[PDB]
Design a protein around this nucleic acid. Structure first.
Lengths: 107, 80, 96, 93, 96, 78, 103, 90
DNA sequence: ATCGGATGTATAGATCTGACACGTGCCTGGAGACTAGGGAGTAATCCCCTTGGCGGTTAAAACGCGGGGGACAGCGCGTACGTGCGTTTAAGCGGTGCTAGAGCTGTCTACGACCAATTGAGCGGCCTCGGCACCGGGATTCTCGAT
DNA sequence: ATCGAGAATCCCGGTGCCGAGGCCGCTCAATTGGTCGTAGACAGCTCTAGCACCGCTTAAACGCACGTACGCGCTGTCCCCCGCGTTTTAACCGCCAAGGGGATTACTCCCTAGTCTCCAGGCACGTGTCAGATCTATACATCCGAT
């Protein structure tokens, strides 16, 4: 019997066995169901893809082919939902979103 | 060591204010900023040192600082 | 001679220091202050360079957010300059 | 000692999202910290959900409710749809 | 013909509601509002009386704290009357 | 249309307990909006907890857990 | 025979040990951890109750109500810090007035 | 299951001539549960961080130093070790 | 400043009453004894990464000097918001039925923990080049003195 | 509303370099395949509390007038912060060296999970009763209009 990874059986790219192992040895519950690692890996993959889409768009807007922490910070702070998700998070070497109050602008 | 809080110079506080989007700064802002930074630093470093002692280590690692920040609700990304 | 009016050079600094992501605080004074503060809790402490880097990043992010709230309070007071009382109100509302 | 990380997995996702875009080591470490933070958040909320209902296991229903609690708005709807699709495809082999 | 100077009776009732520990909002309107809000999430939904009471306690506590922050922002702008801009500033600084 | 049930005197009483001396006329609408947002945020989580428990009534513990979730821990109900 | 009496405490060491086991906190729990945690809980409870009883006496009452607990928590510098994000039901609020609003 | 009898026993130790209402008793139970869960969660994270699998008095001590404010922590640790000191001897 | 009158709390004193503290039965969760095994204490070792020192460049900080523009005080207008009285309304309260559903009980089947092979995905170390940084040079743009 | 000079920033071009990426070897953790025990899925029952209804009482909300005091705009003043030039000064980078302690492994022993037996601590359950909520009368703290 050829070994077929659970991620391939679920169509995911994140590991299902690793997430299952972390759930089992994370002291979360006495038992862990079969579909919980699949669901959690799918959710984590979705969130990762969602951030990487906007980060790549921001990198392309700066004529850059690589993603740096500035692009991740711009992507997260420009999207309302991601900014709400990570409102209490500091990103190393991310800077701040360029916002100047209208009062401070020249008369 | 003696009075290294003066190492957070007035130009540095001005640059931090500029990044925050502040146009004009009073003269008393610098001392208040030094005090607030000092209080925040002691609050974080106390927890970092507590984590270091609990590990029976004499070195304050970056992961200790990350845990101390997460304990206060900061959740620094990057390091570790 | 040519002298820019007081409004504009401050605005150029705002744009310059918002576009970039450097530290803006010198490494050695901040590290020395960190070790000074840590002397109170444990003598002869060793610091990992990544730990000092993380401390600097977190401290500067906190100060930038505090300055944003301070500028908001100053504008709410129908003002442009920030004063200690602005920082005090910002910290009072934030819960510190 | 061999250290584990989500670097290869994030890299695979990046090659199917932006096929010709790279990522720096600092940004990859930030993404690993993101994945770890969300994993711990969702798993802790699922553990609390299992404890509240006197349950001894964490199923896909607990993870679903944890996602609908942590994630805001439309992000939660899409994450729930993706998770349900993955679990259905897994149960259909 | 006895009339109090404006502000005297307003400084009164402040001490009264600092000292008292009642709910300050009628129970039935709040319960109807809770049910109307909840029907958007799940229809034919029941509520325990203690659940509505807990919701009410949380609502009054949050609103009272918000009004204290609003007052702080109002005096910050050299004022006594609170305007909705003070509420907006307090909510923005609080992170809400 | 029960948001009007939060009357003007009720908001005045809340402001009085908050130490507010004078209230502008537009405060009463902003307060209702803020209260509606807060109640929506709390009740969403409360209903989520109720649905997960396969129940049709919102118990007080659901509201307690929802409030503890948002950082607004409440003592007195369990 | 009771572990709480053996440790000179009033909170139940055995119940705290059981709750530590059931809570999924760790795979194993040390013998002295429930004793330590019960002692900490007893000290904190005693502090709250002492300050609340003082508030009740200052209000000329011989019974503690949630108002007295709220007064005790908010009037202490460190207990207010510990319970900053905590709402006491029917606890009220600390009576204060901004000095500028006074005539 | 609650801490009502223990809170009442402590109240008679500190205030022998005062009582407590039922709602204040419930608030005290909520306070005890909240503090218990906070300290136990921090102890579990301390055990996880250092690759240990046992929660000991050292983890509870570190969690108390982390959660409680300064002076209020100093007495609490002073209490806790004392109990262990009494518990170990007998 | 100072007095008097008229409100709105203090203060004392009965008067019920219903939560609160005190007994009772019991039962189930804690205590005591004893065993197995593995988690953690303890020793020893390696190397890395932390600390201390030194020297040279130079970017940044400190200091001093215009000068204008912004904070702040002072006035006046007018309007919005308190205070209060009369009127309306619906909340509060007290009873009643009624039944939806929350909680508890008793099978029983499926599902997750557990253990022994088995091997392929993922990590460590190694070239390897190209994406981004650095340095000139020119064009374009922004600001401010001027009309 | 325009013109023009001076300073700032952006883009095009050339050059360099070191960090992301592909790749190979090698593990050890994920996979497969079985069993076993128990967790919760589900049908059944109970009983309780959530919901609906209705009449009465009256406390609270709403509306309308009126005065006033506070928000807001305007104007003058002065002082203090910003821009700029010049002179320290120590941050920074590169190199070198010593060693403390942070990771590792090996061994062992004792501390905790687990089980059985037994008992009493605490939780329903009931009940007397006084701490306090309410009411009513007297007393005086306070506020506001003349004087």
């Amino acid at each position: 019997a050829k070994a077929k990874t659970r991620s391939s059986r679920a169509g995911l790219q994140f590991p299902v066995g690793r997430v299952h192992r972390l759930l089992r040895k994370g002291n979360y519950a006495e038992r862990v169901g079969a579909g919980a690692p699949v669901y959690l890996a799918a959710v984590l993959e979705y969130l990762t893809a969602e951030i990487l889409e906007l980060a790549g768009n921001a990198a392309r807007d700066n004529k850059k082919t690589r993603i740096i922490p500035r692009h991740l910070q711009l992507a997260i702070r420009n999207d309302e939902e991601l900014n709400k998700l990570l409102g209490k998070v500091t990103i190393a070497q991310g800077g701040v979103l360029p916002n100047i109050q209208a009062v401070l602008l020249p008369k | 060591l003696r009075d290294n809080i003066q190492g957070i110079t007035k130009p540095a506080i001005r640059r931090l204010a500029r990044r925050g989007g502040v146009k004009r700064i009073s003269g008393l802002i610098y001392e208040e900023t030094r005090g607030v930074l000092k209080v925040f630093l002691e609050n974080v470093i106390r927890d970092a040192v507590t984590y270091t002692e609990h590990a029976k280590r004499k070195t304050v690692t970056a992961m200790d600082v990350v845990y101390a920040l997460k304990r206060q609700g900061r959740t620094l990304y990057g390091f570790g | 001679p040519h002298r820019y009016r007081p409004g504009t050079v401050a605005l150029r600094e705002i744009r310059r220091y918002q576009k970039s992501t450097e530290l803006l605080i010198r490494k050695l004074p901040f590290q020395r202050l960190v070790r000074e503060i840590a002397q109170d809790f444990k003598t002869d402490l060793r610091f990992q360079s990544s730990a000092v880097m993380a401390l600097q990043e977190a401290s500067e992010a906190y100060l930038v957010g505090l300055f944003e709230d301070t500028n908001l309070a100053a504008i709410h007071a129908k003002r442009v300059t920030i004063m200690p009382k602005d920082i005090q109100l910002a910290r009072r509302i934030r819960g510190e | 000692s061999r250290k584990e990380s989500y670097s290869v997995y994030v890299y695979k996702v990046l090659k199917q999202v932006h096929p010709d875009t790279g990522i720096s080591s600092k940004a990859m470490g930030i993404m690993n910290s993101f994945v770890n933070d969300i994993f711990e958040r969702i798993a802790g909320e699922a553990s609390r959900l299992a404890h509240y209902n006197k349950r001894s296991t964490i199923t896909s229903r607990e993870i679903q409710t944890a996602v609908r609690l942590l994630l805001p708005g439309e992000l939660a709807k899409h994450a729930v749809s993706e998770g349900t699709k993955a679990v259905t495809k897994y149960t259909s082999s």
